[PDB]
Design an enzyme around this catalytic site. Structure first.
Site, PDB file in Angstrom:
ATOM      1  N   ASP A  58      -5.711  -2.751  15.891  1.00  0.00           N
ATOM      2  CA  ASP A  58      -5.031  -3.158  14.675  1.00  0.00           C
ATOM      3  C   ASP A  58      -3.982  -2.155  14.227  1.00  0.00           C
ATOM      4  OD1 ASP A  58      -6.997  -1.394  14.054  1.00  0.00           O
ATOM      5  OD2 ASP A  58      -7.805  -2.503  12.367  1.00  0.00           O
TER       6      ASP A  58
ATOM      7  N   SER B 148      -0.262  -0.310   9.816  1.00  0.00           N
ATOM      8  CA  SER B 148      -1.682   0.016   9.738  1.00  0.00           C
ATOM      9  C   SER B 148      -2.342  -1.029   8.849  1.00  0.00           C
ATOM     10  CB  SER B 148      -1.898   1.422   9.189  1.00  0.00           C
ATOM     11  OG  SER B 148      -3.277   1.728   9.128  1.00  0.00           O
ATOM     12  N   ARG B 149      -3.227  -1.839   9.434  1.00  0.00           N
ATOM     13  CA  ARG B 149      -3.820  -2.955   8.708  1.00  0.00           C
ATOM     14  C   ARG B 149      -4.816  -2.521   7.648  1.00  0.00           C
ATOM     15  NH1 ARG B 149      -4.133  -6.200  13.381  1.00  0.00           N
ATOM     16  NH2 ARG B 149      -2.075  -7.055  13.868  1.00  0.00           N
ATOM     17  N   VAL B 150      -5.286  -1.284   7.682  1.00  0.00           N
ATOM     18  CA  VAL B 150      -6.271  -0.858   6.703  1.00  0.00           C
ATOM     19  C   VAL B 150      -5.541  -0.297   5.492  1.00  0.00           C
ATOM     20  CG1 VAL B 150      -7.904  -0.464   8.525  1.00  0.00           C
ATOM     21  CG2 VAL B 150      -6.563   1.437   7.677  1.00  0.00           C
TER      22      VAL B 150
END
Lengths: 51, 156, 184
Positions: free
Chosen positions: C21, C46-48
């Protein structure tokens, strides 16, 4: 205002004083680190020769 | 063994001449670099151990020889011979700054004398031409090189 | 993972982008153009997101990402000078200055609190009209200043988590004082 600049005339000379003190203390600490380095070199060389 | 006195570096800019501004920049940037160089060094590494290096190095005599010649090794601090000059030049510029101080005190006292004269002036209703020339000689008709009437040149 | 000629559409990069991800994209033309490390950026995600930041960096660096998005798209259509009002030169000014903020030398990582301090000095004003070639010396002298007499305040920033309002106005005052000492 020139009176105020007269009052502040103990700052520049203090900057020269602590500049010289810091340079000399850094130089003595470099003496210490240097002799540590060379005796470290001697002992590690003997250990690597034995290995 | 350091004696440090940190200043706010604004009066360092307010205190310098035009003659030594570039050298003051050099001393300031060199002092910044030297403070950072102080900050990068921790105070001392630990002493070199000798039980571990005596057990490792089997060379007899050598480990106790280096232990004796290293742990009883002392070197002095590199000397200065400049702090006396810096402090004496400090005292001399303080003495010259003190005579500059008292000259400025006489100058500001003469300023205050002229100002207390000038506030307490004739209110221009009781003023004669002679008293107006007395209170300041800027406007006095000189009567030398213009000795006739009127005592300015006509085109003025 | 390396591509070849930047071809993201190859088999192994599509597979390994699909499984992961977070992904950091370097295009290389910014490496030869001058930013280091050469993240060429909008491809990278960055998906978080903000969940993996400290509270201070979250409080500071979201408007930085939105501003860089605005800067990239306005420079992309106004490559030739399409329309220059005060807003577009503001966008290009803040974008170029933050571009020279994100330059960093090799093998010199810094802690989170100095990053919060320097992106505070870049995003919250105080650097917008300051001659973009002079950003690197600003970085060096600013880090020297803050490591010189502001170690306990950085301890307050990194241990308290959030950058507090007294620390916020104190960073404002210290960056203003250092702007004076930078135009000194």
């Amino acid at each position: 205002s020139q009176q105020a600049l007269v009052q502040k005339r103990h700052y520049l000379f203090d900057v020269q004083r602590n500049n010289i003190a810091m340079a000399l203390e850094v130089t003595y600490r470099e003496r210490l680190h240097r002799v540590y380095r060379e005796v470290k070199n001697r002992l590690d060389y003997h250990i690597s020769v034995q290995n | 063994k350091l004696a440090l006195k940190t200043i706010d570096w604004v009066a360092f800019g307010e205190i310098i001449p035009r003659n030594q501004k570039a050298v003051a920049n050099s001393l300031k940037s060199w002092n910044e670099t030297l403070t950072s160089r102080l900050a990068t060094l921790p105070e001392k590494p630990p002493a070199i151990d000798w039980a571990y290096y005596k057990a490792n190095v089997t060379k007899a005599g050598l480990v106790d020889d280096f232990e004796k010649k290293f742990n009883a090794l002392k070197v002095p601090i590199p000397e200065d011979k400049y702090t006396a000059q810096v402090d004496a030049e400090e005292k001399e510029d303080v003495k010259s700054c003190a005579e500059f101080l008292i000259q400025s005190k006489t100058r500001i006292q003469e300023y205050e004398k002229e100002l207390e004269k000038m506030r307490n002036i004739i209110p221009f209703d009781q003023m004669t031409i002679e008293d107006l020339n007395e209170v300041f000689p800027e406007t006095k008709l000189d009567k030398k090189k213009y000795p006739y009437w009127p005592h300015r040149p006509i085109e003025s | 993972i390396e591509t070849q000629a930047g071809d993201v559409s190859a088999y192994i990069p599509t597979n390994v982008i699909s499984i992961t991800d977070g992904q950091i994209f370097l295009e290389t033309e910014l490496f030869y153009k001058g930013i280091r490390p050469a993240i060429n950026v909008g491809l990278s995600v960055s998906r978080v997101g903000s969940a993996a930041q400290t509270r201070a960096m979250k409080q500071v660096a979201g408007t930085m990402k939105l501003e860089l998005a605005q800067y990239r798209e306005v420079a992309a259509f106004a490559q030739f000078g399409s329309d220059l009002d005060a807003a577009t030169q503001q966008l290009l000014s803040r974008g170029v200055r933050l571009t020279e903020l994100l330059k960093q030398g090799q093998y010199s990582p810094m802690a989170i609190e100095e990053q919060v301090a320097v992106i505070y000095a870049g995003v919250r004003g105080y650097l917008d009209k300051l001659e973009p070639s002079k950003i690197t010396k600003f970085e060096n002298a600013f880090l020297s200043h803050v490591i010189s007499q502001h170690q306990t305040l950085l301890g307050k920033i990194r241990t308290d988590g959030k950058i507090s309002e007294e620390a916020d106005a104190k960073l404002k005052e210290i960056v203003t004082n250092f702007l004076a000492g930078f135009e000194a």
